[PDB]
């Protein structure tokens, strides 16, 4: 299959409550494998998946240095963004970064990603060329110019086409029994009267990995997008995910409705009906 690696950085100021917290988590697809938290009693990079535990002390120390230095730089950055927006010293603010690489089925680099946000809004993003930037506003432009002057894009590109892909491939091999295993959804359809006139049909998908899945209801073969109730895909806590989709149908028309399930773990796309 295709695969990706992403790191997620969050830096949060908290005036009057110490220095900004910095937390980084790293993922391969929908599996987290490391964390670092500057608020930990003893801040260090910690493993979060079994297949990463085999990395040596040199690896853990290298990560910890990277995250410790970033912790300090993001505090500088929070101060800088406060000023770019003429903000008071009273408020809490957040910078987020998410970055990584995507591989195709052949293990080749599809593309790199490096995006940042301030208080939940796009701030600055590296373009797909891994060479130029897109700044959201005149504040982010100050950052753009400073990063252009310092040739930052060449640093990001060198990592994304180099170490990012190399290490993602390494992880994919070490954790191949799980990272390269798609588990198909266990499915079923439930039926619950809502009145004398109508009933709820709910289509369930459980125990699947990765999170990517498509669940849809059709009536007489037509998609019922607008009338379908679709909960967000949710983690079970054992690596797998869950989802359901619900539709309220005229009592007696149940057999006119079909649930369709697409998932990477499925050797064939599923069609289900309610089975009284």
């Amino acid at each position: 299959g295709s695969h990706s690696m992403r790191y997620f950085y969050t830096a949060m100021s908290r005036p009057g409550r110490g220095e900004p917290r910095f937390i980084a988590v790293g993922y391969v697809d929908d599996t987290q494998f490391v964390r670092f938290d500057s608020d930990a009693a003893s801040p260090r990079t910690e493993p979060r998946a079994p297949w990463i535990e085999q990395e040596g002390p040199e690896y853990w120390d290298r990560n910890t240095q990277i995250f410790k230095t970033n912790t300090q730089t993001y505090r500088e950055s929070l101060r800088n963004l406060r000023g770019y927006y003429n903000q008071s010293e009273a408020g809490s603010h957040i910078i987020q970064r998410m970055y990584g690489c995507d591989l195709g089925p052949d293990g080749r680099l599809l593309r790199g990603h490096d995006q940042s946000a301030y208080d939940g809004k796009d701030y600055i993003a590296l373009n797909e060329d891994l060479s130029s930037w897109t700044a959201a506003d005149t504040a982010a432009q100050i950052t753009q110019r400073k990063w252009e002057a310092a040739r930052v894009a060449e640093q990001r590109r060198g990592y994304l086409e180099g170490l990012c892909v190399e290490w993602l491939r390494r992880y994919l091999e070490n954790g191949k029994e799980t990272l390269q295993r798609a588990d198909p959804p266990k499915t079923h359809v439930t039926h619950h009267p809502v009145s004398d006139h109508e009933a709820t049909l709910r289509c369930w998908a459980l125990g699947f990995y990765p999170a990517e899945i498509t669940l849809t209801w059709q009536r007489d073969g037509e998609d019922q997008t607008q009338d379908t109730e679709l909960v967000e895909t949710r983690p079970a806590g054992d690596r797998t995910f869950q989802k359901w989709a619900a539709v309220v149908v005229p009592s007696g028309e149940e057999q006119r409705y079909t649930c369709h399930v697409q998932h990477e773990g499925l050797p064939k796309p599923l069609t289900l009906r309610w089975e009284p």
């Binding site: 790191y7 690896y59 990560n63 240095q65 990277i66 600055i124 930052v152 640093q155």
Partner: peptide
């Protein structure tokens, strides 16, 4: 592996 530190000074925003 996350992005390594550059040889010079890590650039702030």
């Amino acid at each position: 592996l996350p992005e390594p530190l550059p040889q010079g000074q890590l650039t702030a925003y």
